[PDB]
PDB file of C-alpha atoms and ligand atoms in Angstrom:
ATOM      1  CA  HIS A  23       0.000   0.000   0.000  1.00 20.24           C
ATOM      2  CA  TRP A  24       0.808   3.685  -0.406  1.00 18.21           C
ATOM      3  CA  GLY A  25       3.662   5.227   1.506  1.00 18.90           C
ATOM      4  CA  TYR A  26       6.681   7.415   0.814  1.00 19.03           C
ATOM      5  CA  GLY A  27       9.125   4.767  -0.305  1.00 18.97           C
ATOM      6  CA  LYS A  28      10.496   4.466  -3.854  1.00 20.71           C
ATOM      7  CA  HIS A  29       8.071   1.682  -4.680  1.00 20.50           C
ATOM      8  CA  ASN A  30       4.971   3.209  -3.110  1.00 20.64           C
ATOM      9  CA  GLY A  31       5.694   6.937  -3.056  1.00 18.66           C
ATOM     10  CA  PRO A  32       3.840   9.941  -4.351  1.00 17.33           C
ATOM     11  CA  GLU A  33       4.801   9.301  -7.987  1.00 15.51           C
ATOM     12  CA  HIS A  34       2.789   6.093  -7.854  1.00 12.82           C
ATOM     13  CA  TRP A  35      -0.292   7.275  -6.016  1.00 14.39           C
ATOM     14  CA  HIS A  36      -2.135   8.135  -9.280  1.00 14.38           C
ATOM     15  CA  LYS A  37      -2.382   4.382 -10.091  1.00 14.17           C
ATOM     16  CA  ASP A  38      -4.767   3.649  -7.179  1.00 12.71           C
ATOM     17  CA  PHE A  39      -6.002   7.282  -6.807  1.00 12.25           C
ATOM     18  CA  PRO A  40      -6.390   8.891 -10.225  1.00 14.45           C
ATOM     19  CA  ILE A  41      -7.485  12.137  -8.580  1.00 11.61           C
ATOM     20  CA  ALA A  42      -3.782  12.468  -7.843  1.00 11.22           C
ATOM     21  CA  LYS A  43      -3.656  14.312 -11.205  1.00 14.91           C
ATOM     22  CA  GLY A  44      -6.811  16.402 -10.577  1.00 15.23           C
ATOM     23  CA  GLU A  45      -7.256  20.171 -10.912  1.00 14.43           C
ATOM     24  CA  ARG A  46      -7.000  21.161  -7.232  1.00 14.21           C
ATOM     25  CA  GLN A  47      -4.087  19.234  -5.572  1.00 16.52           C
ATOM     26  CA  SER A  48      -2.143  19.822  -2.877  1.00 13.12           C
ATOM     27  CA  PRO A  49       0.546  20.921  -1.715  1.00 15.06           C
ATOM     28  CA  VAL A  50       1.558  23.864  -3.946  1.00 12.85           C
ATOM     29  CA  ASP A  51       4.341  26.444  -4.108  1.00 11.97           C
ATOM     30  CA  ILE A  52       3.244  29.881  -2.877  1.00 12.70           C
ATOM     31  CA  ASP A  53       4.740  32.452  -5.304  1.00  9.77           C
ATOM     32  CA  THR A  54       4.586  35.482  -2.968  1.00 12.02           C
ATOM     33  CA  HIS A  55       4.888  37.930  -5.927  1.00  7.29           C
ATOM     34  CA  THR A  56       1.940  36.306  -7.690  1.00  4.62           C
ATOM     35  CA  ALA A  57      -0.280  35.891  -4.634  1.00  3.60           C
ATOM     36  CA  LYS A  58      -3.235  38.309  -4.650  1.00  2.00           C
ATOM     37  CA  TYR A  59      -3.919  40.687  -1.765  1.00  2.00           C
ATOM     38  CA  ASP A  60      -7.634  40.348  -1.128  1.00  2.00           C
ATOM     39  CA  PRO A  61      -8.996  43.125   1.053  1.00  2.00           C
ATOM     40  CA  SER A  62     -12.321  41.349   1.332  1.00  2.00           C
ATOM     41  CA  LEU A  63     -10.572  38.575   3.262  1.00  2.00           C
ATOM     42  CA  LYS A  64     -11.588  38.475   6.925  1.00  2.00           C
ATOM     43  CA  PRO A  65      -9.227  37.789   9.795  1.00  2.00           C
ATOM     44  CA  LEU A  66      -9.096  34.202  11.085  1.00  2.00           C
ATOM     45  CA  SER A  67     -10.843  33.253  14.291  1.00  2.00           C
ATOM     46  CA  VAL A  68      -9.206  30.361  16.148  1.00  2.00           C
ATOM     47  CA  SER A  69     -11.299  29.340  19.198  1.00  2.00           C
ATOM     48  CA  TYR A  70      -9.353  26.545  20.950  1.00  2.00           C
ATOM     49  CA  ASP A  71      -9.733  27.496  24.594  1.00  2.00           C
ATOM     50  CA  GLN A  72     -12.070  24.535  24.956  1.00  2.00           C
ATOM     51  CA  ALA A  73     -10.203  21.895  22.942  1.00  2.00           C
ATOM     52  CA  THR A  74     -10.363  18.310  24.322  1.00  2.00           C
ATOM     53  CA  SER A  75      -7.396  16.215  23.157  1.00  2.00           C
ATOM     54  CA  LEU A  76      -7.883  12.440  23.578  1.00  2.00           C
ATOM     55  CA  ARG A  77      -4.962  10.462  22.239  1.00  2.00           C
ATOM     56  CA  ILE A  78      -1.968  10.276  19.967  1.00  2.00           C
ATOM     57  CA  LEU A  79      -1.513   7.532  17.406  1.00  2.00           C
ATOM     58  CA  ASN A  80       1.180   6.270  15.026  1.00  2.00           C
ATOM     59  CA  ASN A  81      -0.902   5.496  11.909  1.00  2.00           C
ATOM     60  CA  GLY A  82       2.063   4.322   9.820  1.00  2.00           C
ATOM     61  CA  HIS A  83       2.444   7.543   7.841  1.00  2.00           C
ATOM     62  CA  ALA A  84       2.552  10.184  10.624  1.00  2.00           C
ATOM     63  CA  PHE A  85       1.375  10.619  14.238  1.00  2.00           C
ATOM     64  CA  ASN A  86      -2.015  12.184  14.851  1.00  2.00           C
ATOM     65  CA  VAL A  87      -3.276  13.966  17.956  1.00  2.00           C
ATOM     66  CA  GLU A  88      -7.070  13.454  17.966  1.00  2.00           C
ATOM     67  CA  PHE A  89      -9.637  15.726  19.564  1.00  2.00           C
ATOM     68  CA  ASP A  90     -13.185  15.325  20.780  1.00  2.00           C
ATOM     69  CA  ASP A  91     -15.362  16.809  17.996  1.00  2.00           C
ATOM     70  CA  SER A  92     -18.819  15.731  19.153  1.00  2.00           C
ATOM     71  CA  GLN A  93     -19.376  19.442  19.977  1.00  2.00           C
ATOM     72  CA  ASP A  94     -18.205  22.889  18.945  1.00  2.00           C
ATOM     73  CA  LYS A  95     -15.260  22.644  21.352  1.00  2.00           C
ATOM     74  CA  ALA A  96     -12.282  23.878  19.306  1.00  2.00           C
ATOM     75  CA  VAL A  97     -13.291  25.673  16.053  1.00  2.00           C
ATOM     76  CA  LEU A  98     -12.029  27.690  13.189  1.00  2.00           C
ATOM     77  CA  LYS A  99     -14.017  30.476  11.442  1.00  2.00           C
ATOM     78  CA  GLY A 100     -13.509  33.787   9.606  1.00  2.00           C
ATOM     79  CA  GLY A 101     -10.805  33.953   6.958  1.00  2.00           C
ATOM     80  CA  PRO A 102     -12.055  32.754   3.588  1.00  2.00           C
ATOM     81  CA  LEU A 103     -14.493  30.431   5.353  1.00  2.00           C
ATOM     82  CA  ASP A 104     -18.255  30.621   5.801  1.00  2.00           C
ATOM     83  CA  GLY A 105     -19.597  28.681   8.859  1.00  2.00           C
ATOM     84  CA  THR A 106     -17.770  26.775  11.562  1.00  2.00           C
ATOM     85  CA  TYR A 107     -15.078  24.177  11.198  1.00  2.00           C
ATOM     86  CA  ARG A 108     -14.306  21.858  14.045  1.00  2.00           C
ATOM     87  CA  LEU A 109     -10.776  20.602  14.852  1.00  2.00           C
ATOM     88  CA  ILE A 110     -10.611  16.807  14.563  1.00  2.00           C
ATOM     89  CA  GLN A 111      -6.870  16.168  14.594  1.00  2.00           C
ATOM     90  CA  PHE A 112      -3.432  17.652  14.012  1.00  2.00           C
ATOM     91  CA  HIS A 113      -0.323  15.936  12.561  1.00  2.00           C
ATOM     92  CA  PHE A 114       2.992  16.859  11.011  1.00  2.00           C
ATOM     93  CA  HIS A 115       5.050  16.164   7.870  1.00  2.00           C
ATOM     94  CA  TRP A 116       8.816  16.287   8.397  1.00  2.00           C
ATOM     95  CA  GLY A 117      12.038  15.452   6.539  1.00  2.00           C
ATOM     96  CA  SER A 118      15.182  13.419   7.048  1.00  2.00           C
ATOM     97  CA  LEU A 119      17.097  16.765   7.071  1.00  2.00           C
ATOM     98  CA  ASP A 120      16.429  20.357   8.212  1.00  2.00           C
ATOM     99  CA  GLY A 121      16.363  21.560   4.617  1.00  2.00           C
ATOM    100  CA  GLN A 122      13.223  19.638   3.624  1.00  2.00           C
ATOM    101  CA  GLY A 123       9.965  18.472   5.230  1.00  2.00           C
ATOM    102  CA  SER A 124       7.213  21.000   4.562  1.00  2.00           C
ATOM    103  CA  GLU A 125       4.555  20.197   1.991  1.00  2.00           C
ATOM    104  CA  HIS A 126       3.770  23.709   0.834  1.00  2.00           C
ATOM    105  CA  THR A 127       6.760  25.861  -0.177  1.00  2.00           C
ATOM    106  CA  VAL A 128       7.147  29.709  -0.206  1.00  2.00           C
ATOM    107  CA  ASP A 129       8.983  30.898  -3.318  1.00  2.00           C
ATOM    108  CA  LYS A 130      10.346  27.354  -3.549  1.00  2.00           C
ATOM    109  CA  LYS A 131      11.709  27.501  -0.001  1.00  2.00           C
ATOM    110  CA  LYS A 132      11.166  24.245   1.997  1.00  2.00           C
ATOM    111  CA  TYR A 133      10.797  24.216   5.820  1.00  2.00           C
ATOM    112  CA  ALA A 134      11.869  21.488   8.296  1.00  2.00           C
ATOM    113  CA  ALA A 135       8.302  20.452   8.935  1.00  2.00           C
ATOM    114  CA  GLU A 136       4.658  21.429   8.497  1.00  2.00           C
ATOM    115  CA  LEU A 137       1.864  21.214  11.027  1.00  2.00           C
ATOM    116  CA  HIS A 138      -1.644  20.482   9.765  1.00  2.00           C
ATOM    117  CA  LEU A 139      -4.640  21.268  12.000  1.00  2.00           C
ATOM    118  CA  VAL A 140      -7.550  19.492  10.283  1.00  2.00           C
ATOM    119  CA  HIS A 141     -11.135  20.828  10.647  1.00  2.00           C
ATOM    120  CA  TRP A 142     -14.446  19.790   9.043  1.00  2.00           C
ATOM    121  CA  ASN A 143     -17.456  22.010   8.174  1.00  2.00           C
ATOM    122  CA  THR A 144     -20.177  21.302  10.820  1.00  2.00           C
ATOM    123  CA  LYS A 145     -23.036  21.915   8.330  1.00  2.00           C
ATOM    124  CA  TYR A 146     -22.222  18.482   6.895  1.00  2.00           C
ATOM    125  CA  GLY A 147     -22.827  16.664  10.232  1.00  2.00           C
ATOM    126  CA  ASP A 148     -19.879  14.307  10.306  1.00  2.00           C
ATOM    127  CA  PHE A 149     -16.349  14.104   8.934  1.00  2.00           C
ATOM    128  CA  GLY A 150     -17.293  11.351   6.501  1.00  2.00           C
ATOM    129  CA  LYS A 151     -19.893  13.659   4.899  1.00  2.00           C
ATOM    130  CA  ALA A 152     -17.527  16.658   4.857  1.00  2.00           C
ATOM    131  CA  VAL A 153     -15.141  14.698   2.618  1.00  2.00           C
ATOM    132  CA  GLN A 154     -17.812  14.496  -0.088  1.00  2.00           C
ATOM    133  CA  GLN A 155     -18.098  18.330  -0.413  1.00  2.00           C
ATOM    134  CA  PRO A 156     -15.868  20.862  -2.119  1.00  2.00           C
ATOM    135  CA  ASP A 157     -15.932  23.085   1.022  1.00  2.00           C
ATOM    136  CA  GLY A 158     -15.810  20.126   3.381  1.00  2.00           C
ATOM    137  CA  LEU A 159     -12.513  20.717   5.169  1.00  2.00           C
ATOM    138  CA  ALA A 160     -10.235  23.534   6.266  1.00  2.00           C
ATOM    139  CA  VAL A 161      -6.602  22.774   7.006  1.00  2.00           C
ATOM    140  CA  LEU A 162      -4.520  25.325   8.902  1.00  2.00           C
ATOM    141  CA  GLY A 163      -0.874  24.924   7.804  1.00  2.00           C
ATOM    142  CA  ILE A 164       2.001  26.090   9.954  1.00  2.00           C
ATOM    143  CA  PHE A 165       5.621  25.840   8.905  1.00  2.00           C
ATOM    144  CA  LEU A 166       8.283  24.744  11.405  1.00  2.00           C
ATOM    145  CA  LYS A 167      11.810  26.182  11.146  1.00  2.00           C
ATOM    146  CA  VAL A 168      14.771  24.896  13.283  1.00  2.00           C
ATOM    147  CA  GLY A 169      15.891  27.369  15.993  1.00  2.00           C
ATOM    148  CA  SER A 170      14.717  27.774  19.578  1.00  2.00           C
ATOM    149  CA  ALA A 171      12.591  25.137  21.254  1.00  2.00           C
ATOM    150  CA  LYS A 172       8.793  25.447  21.235  1.00  2.00           C
ATOM    151  CA  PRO A 173       7.705  25.047  24.839  1.00  2.00           C
ATOM    152  CA  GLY A 174       4.248  23.945  23.714  1.00  2.00           C
ATOM    153  CA  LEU A 175       5.476  21.173  21.479  1.00  2.00           C
ATOM    154  CA  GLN A 176       7.539  19.380  24.213  1.00  2.00           C
ATOM    155  CA  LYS A 177       4.531  17.508  25.584  1.00  2.00           C
ATOM    156  CA  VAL A 178       4.115  15.787  22.167  1.00  2.00           C
ATOM    157  CA  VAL A 179       7.815  15.110  21.782  1.00  2.00           C
ATOM    158  CA  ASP A 180       7.949  13.257  25.153  1.00  2.00           C
ATOM    159  CA  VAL A 181       5.160  10.775  24.324  1.00  2.00           C
ATOM    160  CA  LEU A 182       6.700   9.781  20.972  1.00  2.00           C
ATOM    161  CA  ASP A 183       8.639   6.954  22.597  1.00  2.00           C
ATOM    162  CA  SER A 184       5.308   5.364  23.541  1.00  2.00           C
ATOM    163  CA  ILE A 185       3.948   5.187  19.963  1.00  2.00           C
ATOM    164  CA  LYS A 186       7.112   4.212  18.094  1.00  2.00           C
ATOM    165  CA  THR A 187       5.543   1.771  15.648  1.00  2.00           C
ATOM    166  CA  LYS A 188       2.461   1.765  13.446  1.00  2.00           C
ATOM    167  CA  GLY A 189      -0.765   0.986  15.298  1.00  2.00           C
ATOM    168  CA  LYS A 190       0.418   2.139  18.745  1.00  2.00           C
ATOM    169  CA  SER A 191      -1.555   4.789  20.604  1.00  2.00           C
ATOM    170  CA  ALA A 192      -1.317   6.535  24.003  1.00  2.00           C
ATOM    171  CA  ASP A 193      -3.906   8.548  26.057  1.00  2.00           C
ATOM    172  CA  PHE A 194      -3.171  12.219  25.365  1.00  2.00           C
ATOM    173  CA  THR A 195      -5.591  14.394  27.321  1.00  2.00           C
ATOM    174  CA  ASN A 196      -5.340  18.021  28.310  1.00  2.00           C
ATOM    175  CA  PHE A 197      -3.155  19.060  25.346  1.00  2.00           C
ATOM    176  CA  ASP A 198      -3.689  22.751  24.473  1.00  2.00           C
ATOM    177  CA  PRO A 199      -3.156  23.478  20.748  1.00  2.00           C
ATOM    178  CA  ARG A 200      -2.802  27.191  21.294  1.00  2.00           C
ATOM    179  CA  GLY A 201       0.809  26.458  22.261  1.00  2.00           C
ATOM    180  CA  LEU A 202       1.552  25.614  18.604  1.00  2.00           C
ATOM    181  CA  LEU A 203       0.374  28.887  16.956  1.00  2.00           C
ATOM    182  CA  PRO A 204       2.735  31.667  15.732  1.00  2.00           C
ATOM    183  CA  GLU A 205       2.163  35.247  16.931  1.00  2.00           C
ATOM    184  CA  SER A 206       0.595  36.449  13.701  1.00  2.00           C
ATOM    185  CA  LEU A 207      -2.434  34.996  11.924  1.00  2.00           C
ATOM    186  CA  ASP A 208      -1.633  36.444   8.483  1.00  2.00           C
ATOM    187  CA  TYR A 209      -2.237  33.794   5.844  1.00  2.00           C
ATOM    188  CA  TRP A 210      -2.417  32.662   2.205  1.00  2.00           C
ATOM    189  CA  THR A 211      -5.467  30.664   1.115  1.00  2.00           C
ATOM    190  CA  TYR A 212      -6.359  28.557  -1.920  1.00  2.00           C
ATOM    191  CA  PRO A 213      -8.666  25.734  -2.915  1.00  2.00           C
ATOM    192  CA  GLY A 214      -6.973  22.321  -2.637  1.00  2.00           C
ATOM    193  CA  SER A 215      -6.974  18.707  -1.430  1.00  2.00           C
ATOM    194  CA  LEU A 216      -5.754  16.168   1.174  1.00  2.00           C
ATOM    195  CA  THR A 217      -2.010  15.658   0.731  1.00  2.00           C
ATOM    196  CA  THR A 218      -2.185  11.883   1.254  1.00  2.00           C
ATOM    197  CA  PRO A 219      -4.475   9.256  -0.353  1.00  2.00           C
ATOM    198  CA  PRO A 220      -7.337   9.512  -0.908  1.00  2.00           C
ATOM    199  CA  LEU A 221      -6.318  13.022  -2.031  1.00  2.00           C
ATOM    200  CA  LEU A 222      -9.887  14.298  -2.022  1.00  2.00           C
ATOM    201  CA  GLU A 223     -10.384  17.808  -3.269  1.00  2.00           C
ATOM    202  CA  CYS A 224     -12.425  19.110  -0.364  1.00  2.00           C
ATOM    203  CA  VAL A 225      -9.962  21.394   1.366  1.00  2.00           C
ATOM    204  CA  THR A 226      -9.761  25.170   1.820  1.00  2.00           C
ATOM    205  CA  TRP A 227      -6.033  25.664   2.698  1.00  2.00           C
ATOM    206  CA  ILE A 228      -5.015  28.306   5.203  1.00  2.00           C
ATOM    207  CA  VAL A 229      -1.246  28.559   5.257  1.00  2.00           C
ATOM    208  CA  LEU A 230       0.159  30.902   7.958  1.00  2.00           C
ATOM    209  CA  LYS A 231       2.800  33.392   6.774  1.00  2.00           C
ATOM    210  CA  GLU A 232       4.719  33.181  10.022  1.00  2.00           C
ATOM    211  CA  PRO A 233       6.575  29.927  10.888  1.00  2.00           C
ATOM    212  CA  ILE A 234       7.009  28.580  14.434  1.00  2.00           C
ATOM    213  CA  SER A 235      10.549  27.642  15.530  1.00  2.00           C
ATOM    214  CA  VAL A 236      11.352  24.290  17.123  1.00  2.00           C
ATOM    215  CA  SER A 237      14.722  22.999  18.341  1.00  2.00           C
ATOM    216  CA  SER A 238      17.004  20.573  16.591  1.00  2.00           C
ATOM    217  CA  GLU A 239      16.397  18.060  19.388  1.00  2.00           C
ATOM    218  CA  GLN A 240      12.600  18.435  19.133  1.00  2.00           C
ATOM    219  CA  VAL A 241      12.751  17.689  15.353  1.00  2.00           C
ATOM    220  CA  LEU A 242      15.192  14.781  15.963  1.00  2.00           C
ATOM    221  CA  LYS A 243      12.612  12.933  18.110  1.00  2.00           C
ATOM    222  CA  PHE A 244      10.117  13.021  15.223  1.00  2.00           C
ATOM    223  CA  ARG A 245      12.631  11.120  13.098  1.00  2.00           C
ATOM    224  CA  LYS A 246      12.916   8.290  15.623  1.00  2.00           C
ATOM    225  CA  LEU A 247       9.390   7.077  14.810  1.00  2.00           C
ATOM    226  CA  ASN A 248       8.849   3.964  12.612  1.00  2.00           C
ATOM    227  CA  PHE A 249       6.619   3.508   9.536  1.00  2.00           C
ATOM    228  CA  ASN A 250       6.457  -0.170  10.340  1.00  2.00           C
ATOM    229  CA  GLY A 251       4.545  -2.038  13.050  1.00  2.00           C
ATOM    230  CA  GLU A 252       6.184  -3.731  16.006  1.00  2.00           C
ATOM    231  CA  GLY A 253       8.206  -6.880  15.147  1.00  2.00           C
ATOM    232  CA  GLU A 254       8.772  -5.862  11.484  1.00  2.00           C
ATOM    233  CA  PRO A 255      11.955  -4.585   9.806  1.00  2.00           C
ATOM    234  CA  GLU A 256      12.604  -1.067  11.066  1.00  2.00           C
ATOM    235  CA  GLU A 257      11.926   1.839   8.632  1.00  2.00           C
ATOM    236  CA  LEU A 258      12.406   5.386   9.970  1.00  2.00           C
ATOM    237  CA  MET A 259       9.465   7.745   9.599  1.00  2.00           C
ATOM    238  CA  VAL A 260      11.093  10.564   7.654  1.00  2.00           C
ATOM    239  CA  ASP A 261      10.234  12.516   4.499  1.00  2.00           C
ATOM    240  CA  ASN A 262       6.472  11.820   4.822  1.00  2.00           C
ATOM    241  CA  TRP A 263       5.765  14.720   2.489  1.00  2.00           C
ATOM    242  CA  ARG A 264       4.370  15.168  -0.995  1.00  2.00           C
ATOM    243  CA  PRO A 265       6.009  17.358  -3.620  1.00  2.00           C
ATOM    244  CA  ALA A 266       4.340  20.589  -4.761  1.00  2.00           C
ATOM    245  CA  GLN A 267       1.605  20.119  -7.398  1.00  2.00           C
ATOM    246  CA  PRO A 268       0.630  22.301 -10.405  1.00  2.00           C
ATOM    247  CA  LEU A 269      -1.440  25.313  -9.461  1.00  2.00           C
ATOM    248  CA  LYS A 270      -3.414  24.974 -12.703  1.00  2.00           C
ATOM    249  CA  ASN A 271      -4.992  28.474 -12.938  1.00  2.00           C
ATOM    250  CA  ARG A 272      -6.129  28.538  -9.285  1.00  2.00           C
ATOM    251  CA  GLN A 273      -5.343  31.863  -7.557  1.00  2.00           C
ATOM    252  CA  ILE A 274      -3.579  32.221  -4.233  1.00  2.00           C
ATOM    253  CA  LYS A 275      -5.050  35.038  -2.176  1.00  2.00           C
ATOM    254  CA  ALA A 276      -3.127  36.793   0.611  1.00  2.00           C
ATOM    255  CA  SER A 277      -4.723  38.314   3.678  1.00  2.00           C
ATOM    256  CA  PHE A 278      -1.841  40.755   3.753  1.00  2.00           C
TER     257      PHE A 278
HETATM  258  N1  EG1 B 327     -16.950   6.268   2.699  1.00  2.00           N
HETATM  259  C1  EG1 B 327     -15.699   5.445   2.511  1.00  2.00           C
HETATM  260  C2  EG1 B 327     -14.517   6.406   2.841  1.00  2.00           C
HETATM  261  O1  EG1 B 327     -13.351   6.055   2.830  1.00  2.00           O
HETATM  262  N2  EG1 B 327     -14.848   7.772   3.214  1.00  2.00           N
HETATM  263  C3  EG1 B 327     -13.696   8.440   3.796  1.00  2.00           C
HETATM  264  C4  EG1 B 327     -14.062   9.788   4.159  1.00  2.00           C
HETATM  265  O2  EG1 B 327     -12.953  10.667   4.017  1.00  2.00           O
HETATM  266  C5  EG1 B 327     -11.765   9.861   4.120  1.00  2.00           C
HETATM  267  C6  EG1 B 327     -10.536  10.689   4.010  1.00  2.00           C
HETATM  268  O3  EG1 B 327      -9.413   9.910   4.522  1.00  2.00           O
HETATM  269  C7  EG1 B 327      -9.394  10.004   5.979  1.00  2.00           C
HETATM  270  C8  EG1 B 327      -7.972  10.015   6.436  1.00  2.00           C
HETATM  271  N3  EG1 B 327      -7.190  11.226   6.126  1.00  2.00           N
HETATM  272  C9  EG1 B 327      -7.373  12.388   6.659  1.00  2.00           C
HETATM  273  O4  EG1 B 327      -8.294  12.508   7.447  1.00  2.00           O
HETATM  274  C10 EG1 B 327      -6.480  13.432   6.261  1.00  2.00           C
HETATM  275  C11 EG1 B 327      -6.684  14.686   6.785  1.00  2.00           C
HETATM  276  C12 EG1 B 327      -5.832  15.721   6.391  1.00  2.00           C
HETATM  277  C13 EG1 B 327      -4.794  15.562   5.434  1.00  2.00           C
HETATM  278  S1  EG1 B 327      -3.763  16.762   5.037  1.00  2.00           S
HETATM  279  N4  EG1 B 327      -2.469  16.115   5.029  1.00  2.00           N
HETATM  280  O5  EG1 B 327      -4.026  17.313   3.756  1.00  2.00           O
HETATM  281  O6  EG1 B 327      -3.973  17.726   6.086  1.00  2.00           O
HETATM  282  C14 EG1 B 327      -4.574  14.249   4.948  1.00  2.00           C
HETATM  283  C15 EG1 B 327      -5.422  13.184   5.313  1.00  2.00           C
HETATM  284 HG1   HG B 328     -14.554  16.832  -1.798  1.00  2.00          HG
HETATM  285 ZN1   ZN B 329      -0.929  16.718   6.484  1.00  2.00          ZN
END
């Protein structure tokens, strides 16, 4: 099955998921000189004071921190969006080296990692239904650059040892996502898709201008994770990112 290896990597995904070559894929390069300043763009509204984290899980392609989304607990609104989007999970994409790892690029510049905070439009009732609509999801993308440690990320880093292989999970309550946000909420937005199979084109991307910094040691722990399950040949979970895809006439709007 699909992965990031040379035999099952992104270049092969189109075979089982033809949408891989659709008209609104994701990730893309943000050409900052071609991005359009849209004055009609509203400021983002991140309401995560009430977020209820549940657990963390190694799903074989990344680690996900899941939240309780049975109620309007942690939501995203404003920006290019209409209605409320509820946080379901967050995960990262990282590289084998500091010079690569992000999915989206800014003027072809790659970051060490990229944080994705996944939300689904509540008008559709459930996540499964949101994935069948063109305005079904909203993913908040935050770039990670190597520098100073991120206080707020440390809690995640420490549990990683507990979910080393695919299929492992650990309780992960009382995690506050606000600790992962940059100071500024300026963003780029464009119509896109999931970045992993099934690559559904249901996402409104909100990519923050300002990156968060993490330490070398924080990033290193990410790379200690395994793609494989327990008792199988060890394969380091690195470079779980997809290359930039053709914009194809879509327009990237800037809130700044
Ligand atoms: N009805 C059968 C069926 O499979 N329906 C599935 C409904 O939607 C399924 C989508 O796959 C779910 C798993 N993936 C994700 O949730 C998921 C979420 C976000 C991103 S990303 N990287 O673009 O932020 C990538 C993947
Ligand atoms: Hg869709
Ligand atoms: Zn992602």
